[model samples]
Target chain A: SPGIWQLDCTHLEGKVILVAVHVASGYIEAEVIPAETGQETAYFLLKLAGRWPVKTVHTDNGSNFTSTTVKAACDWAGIKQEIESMNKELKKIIGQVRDQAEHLKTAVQMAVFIHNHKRKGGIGGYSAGERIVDIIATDI
Target chain B: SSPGIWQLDCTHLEGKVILVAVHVASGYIEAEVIPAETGQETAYFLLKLAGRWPVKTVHTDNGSNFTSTTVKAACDWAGIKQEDGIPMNKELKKIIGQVRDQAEHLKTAVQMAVFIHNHKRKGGIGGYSAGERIVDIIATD
Candidate 1:
């Protein structure tokens, strides 16, 4: 499987939003974490293994915690643009939560849910969630 | 995202609970069809709406749906201040009534109506659509 998972993280109030975008399907998975440590970040990627075929995990200077640790765990790809766009869109979706971190957890979940459902691929006219379902259907 | 305020309100019609929140600054409207009128349920929707934009305060009528202990507690927990009797959005209320009258799957119909209201429909400040104003405000942020 050539499915690629691009990873990135952004700050909200004091927490971190760990974002992963599957490039081929444009499917996204995000979670709010306490910090951007490599350990916490890896746990999210581990969870993605159950839902997605994680063949290639890509990042650019991924995190400051451990540069070579996650790099050595999986192969890297040269893709950087998609997740960058995703993070911007995700932040826009998150808007301003300067003092609303408690609300942010559910916000992140619902934001990704809406993103997957409403966004259609330019070429395929299928939402990311629909594409993921179709891919999963084919896998079975 | 400039710490804008939102107006929160709900209406019960045709055996459905329709929740609506409007960003006071941009008039960007968001609504959901929930299963119940419990404060916990309304609070969940409120918290979810707060995530989409920065909220400084919320104004609602003195109805139990807005003033219940559960909802107010959630607001304080999220650092949002609350007030009472700010008035309702007549435009959104009208949209809800229309959707309810024609809806089969009420959730999907309400969502479609909201999308059209924010994106396709335009008649707020400066004659710009709610979504356009939201975009301009965000760009300035």
Candidate 2:
């Protein structure tokens, strides 16, 4: 049941935060690597982590996004993405993170947890995670 | 490719997670326990696997914890690959399952099973027991 997702990074204080989001559910997964270079990015993207599958990736003209490492890793793992300024909304949604890279990463993950679990205006006032709570119960 | 790919998986019984690793080539295997089935704990267990053998790739089920960067980085840095595959080695699991079903104490039970396996005389391996095959440092997981 792994599915399509997108990933891109943004500056958070002195550190960079990479966000991976589920395409359909908007469920977010985040990571904090040492740098933003493809060497760092490839490690993040190629890491066989997460529950869903990634099929495609979209990015801007940044050199980090336009490299053999990124392309090859994506092709190898079958992940998909886009550079849609989603990180901006992510910044807004996340807690105020400064001089705190770990805090920033944690904040993004917590935000995802809340976003997926809290009651939203849509989806019959149930969180995305709540909507799928039955599936979660089946396994655990 | 490494001569044998060992698949590691965990089974929960009696509210505890039992970690299992099986060598596909020799039918050799081991099991252990973790504080919890989280990535850091899983990486620690897998690191032990790499420490005990010349591991190249690690295959496991699609648990988010196992596939995390925390564990993947260790495997990558160790020059070992990680693959997310379903558990295909039922024989090893069967033995673990039997021990779980029969043993009053699992900790020593798995160790005895391993010792029995390692010390057994086999017609295979030129009549060498599994323990005898390893001239190098060896301990059953």
Candidate 3:
């Protein structure tokens, strides 16, 4: 039941697109025209993170996610925005190999799992997931 | 003072070990086994084999004769290359499969002996030993 939907952005001129992803299941839902500009995305993301739980939101180098509006919302919600480069060699390989929409979702999940399990030499052997999980457990 | 060498293993021979040397191009073999204790005897035996032929290269495992300074000097004087197997690797073990088959038939000894003397006795082109047949032979040209 995984599907991709391209929003019709013709109606929403001069508005930023909001891409919302369910972190746990990697389910993505997007909105082209929000009530406010970048604030709606950050607000919804904060609400989603607060309730269902999420530590990081990875996005491309886009204006909507990096704008002051989103940054302020993220600061207020105590969440982090991980802005990654749109142009990466490994990402290009993934794009070339990942033809189907579901493939991209599955690949992202697997990549995250592998990245978390392996040691990052510079940042100690423990991964981001391990740090987040430990922090959450301590907080609870 | 001709230059050539060959190494043969007969570890399964229990008390004895066979080492052979032959001319590379001519394919003439000189073979013998020495008592297992003094592995150096294998080198001496090879020296005796070389009396019948010349030695250029001596290839073997990291056994004492192949690794010892005495053997090294001898090979150096004789202008012979001493080659040893890669450390802790089983690439050489591939020969074990064919040897296993030969052992199963209990004909390894006779077959090896015949193969060594093949060039001398076969009287064919180049007069080389026709070793174990691993592949099928087709009669068609």
Candidate 4:
């Protein structure tokens, strides 16, 4: 599969940054910025990709991915940035219905599952994990 | 201005009905409707109403008013207390604002306008009635 490695930015202090890399293709990127501010991380991802064709970048609307910086970066890179709005709303409603922590964990798992399986094709018929490897081995 | 109080019955024997009450307090009107409109009612409904807090004590004008008996009993049962104002007091006259007055005025004005325009005016494009034209204008924009 592609280089869909999850960066454990959960441990990182100050500014939180989680980078998902297409290891095979060397498409280095990060999102899930801490401080509830994501524009910087988005700008960093764009800076990393430089001129490479970014077919799709997926993340929850964690301030960073939905921030204007990330949006602008996707616009400039001609990449489609998919953020889950419905999932976020679901999480909110679920939290109201259930306990906060449990709802959040469920939401995270759902987010990952939907992004990997439900989303439509762009980089072949493969998932993000699959595309990362394929692009690295074949193209780069 | 004296606070105006009125009871709006949402109960229609024909079908499930939702009672909505709008209370004007401190120059703002707050609205709430029964969530279920039917079935086992709970204190949850009262809690939902109380969520809009800081309601300056409500006034009950009579002993047998439907609003007074049911709502007051519910409030007392829920441990929600309110101040009771004297009925038919002369000073209470100052506190009265024509309750439901604006709604009545608007309804009459709209009916009169519709009647005159429909009867007196020439048909617009497509031969639409004055009421139809007015509805179309309001609906589109």
Candidate 5:
């Protein structure tokens, strides 16, 4: 309960996944929020809530939009949900994984890694950058 | 008090056995797929990975594998305290659920999980990434 951690689910995070894109930078990440295990939404975004500044992230107002996790992350790295380019790319990736729907998490993680694996001033000078803290949701 | 002890064990992950070591203070971890049943070889292998960090002590379940000449010599040579008595099942499970058959390359999967889980900042850690909780890490000063 204190320093220990446990993963409640192995393959799912509700029926969908969430993606975050940077307006200044082209960096993007994905997260899988588990509805059944009662974690992931808050769990995946908690660390993020600390990094990105608050009161600025853009997202859908419906669903559990009031949850502290979502609200806090928004307050940090403001973005309209930063859709569009990301949405189009996600659709293409989804098509590739359309058959392997069960392995959603794996697909998303690899997708982000492959799609965003460009050489640029990261962390400044190829060491690091706005890394992907968003947990990927896709099929294996 | 700076370079501390580690509690370690060999447990199941995706059906295959793995050697997992825990640094409780920082919630940092190191692991390897079981290449040997007798944990002496595996324990030594894990110590090789731990050598990068300043490990003062290692606690393991007092199985025949841990209390042997090879394992003892390895720890002794490395200036590491080898304490044996309790089972490590409780600690290893704290990182991940003990299940096998989750994938074909079980060892690789376990390592990936360890890496991802170790990077996250936890409430218990006061919102510092596990790596940030350490001293003299690869991070810049």
Candidate 6:
């Protein structure tokens, strides 16, 4: 099930959004937290997206993700930390709709909804929802 | 075609997953603590309760697990469609987040949240709770 996932933290309206994208399906899970910390990031993953079997988590070089807290959390879960930086299209969304949203959480919730619901050109014309449906369908 | 569309989504807490589904027309709600958010699990959820009520379309966000091929096939196989979003989306989250630590167990917390949602909480086109509305629909059916 969503084995490989990409994780990132972004700043929006004085809040930090912990974003995790399923690599293959492009489904995004995000939570708006007041601040970012190694502990919090680890908790977010385990609490938000940990229901699925996760083998590896790819993230950038942020101290929040690099802290011993996150490392320990991964080790306990038998998950690997593939520490490498990557760019996110989430940034572009933030840049465009940053000021328009009244609340950071609202923006994040909508951004995630739009990203996952809208069709992506990269993976053909299917939206993230359709792609996930296809992926899960085949697995079964 | 049934007018009722069931909305499904999930949230994780304390390493446990809480998946919830809400029926649009009747406001009936169902929830479970599932092992994974895979299409298989979601499809199973649908099939498991397929007898409980008439389903027009199943709905969920673009979470990979929900959108996977398995889910699509399940929908097609059942001659159903898909659609998402609801007041319970945020409402359930708040209750779960607030009482998670206080509840003796995660499952209990989820059950409590679902109970509150379907029974006590009220909103929508009418001022009726989901529990009350569901009964009204069932009585008519």
Note the clash tally of each candidate: 0, 14, 4, 10, 22, 13
**Least accurate 10 contiguous residues by lDDT in model 2 chain B:** B132-141
lDDT of 6 by residue, A19-133 (tens): 7777787766677788997756866655432233467888888888778767755765567888122226666665666575556665555456556656666644766645554
The chain B TM-scores of all candidates, as shown, are 0.79, 0.72, 0.50, 0.30, 0.75, 0.75
Among all candidates shown, the one with the greatest lDDT: 6
DockQ of each: 0.04, 0.01, 0.00, 0.01, 0.02, 0.02
In the range A1-140, model 1's lDDT, one tens digit per residue, is: 33677787787669988888877666788878998876565445544542334666776565542444343223221112225776787677667432443467766865775666654647657666556545544443
When only the first chain is scored, the TM-scores of the models are: 0.73, 0.67, 0.39, 0.44, 0.53, 0.75
Q: Compared with the true structure, what per-residue lDDT tens digits does model 4 show for residues B1-141?
A: 232332222322123233323233211221222334321232233323332222223443322333345455545543455544432111111111221242133222222222233322244453643323322322211
lDDT of 2 by residue, A7-123 (tens): 767776677777776555444556556578876676556532212234555455678876777775565445654525445555766754333334454455444444444455864
Q: Please, what are the lDDT tens digits per residue for candidate 1 over residues B1-141?
A: 342678877777569888877777776777777888788777777765554344668888767777799888768755678887865356656665665554346664565456556654455444766655654554311
CAPRI verdict (incorrect, acceptable, medium, high) for model 6: incorrect
Alpha-carbon local distance difference test for all models:
0.63, 0.55, 0.39, 0.36, 0.49, 0.63
Question: Residue A88 in model 5: shift from native, Å?
Answer: 49
Better of 1 and 3 by DockQ: 1
lDDT of 5 by residue, B8-28 (tens): 777765566777777667666
Q: On residues A42-82, what C-alpha lDDT tens digit does candidate 5 reach at each position?
A: 43444333322222345444445556544443343231121
Q: Give the lDDT of residue B35 in candidate 3.
A: 49
Point out the higher-scoring one by DockQ: 2 or 5: 5
How well does candidate 2 score on lDDT at residue A16?
79
Candidate 5 wrongly placed segments (more than 4 Å):
A1-140, B86-103, B124-126, B136-141
What tens-digit string does per-residue lDDT give for candidate 6 at B1-141?
Answer: 134567777778778787887777766677778898877777766653442344567767768876688777656655667663323567887877776774456765665566556655465555766655554443311
Give all TM-scores, in the order shown.
0.49, 0.42, 0.30, 0.26, 0.43, 0.48
RMSD (Cα, Å) for all candidates, in order, is 15.7, 18.1, 31.6, 24.3, 13.8, 15.0
Which candidate comes out best when scored by TM-score? 1
| Residue-by-residue lDDT tens digits, candidate 3, A1-140 | 11111111112235433434333223223333434445445544543332223446666565557777578656644566770221132244334544532423333322333333333457545443344334333333
Give the higher-lDDT candidate: 2 or 4. Answer: 2
Best by DockQ: 1
Compared with the true structure, what per-residue lDDT tens digits does model 3 show for residues B1-141?
122445544443444454544344434344443445253455445443332223456667666666777566545544557777732012112333334443333223322343324312244563323211100010011
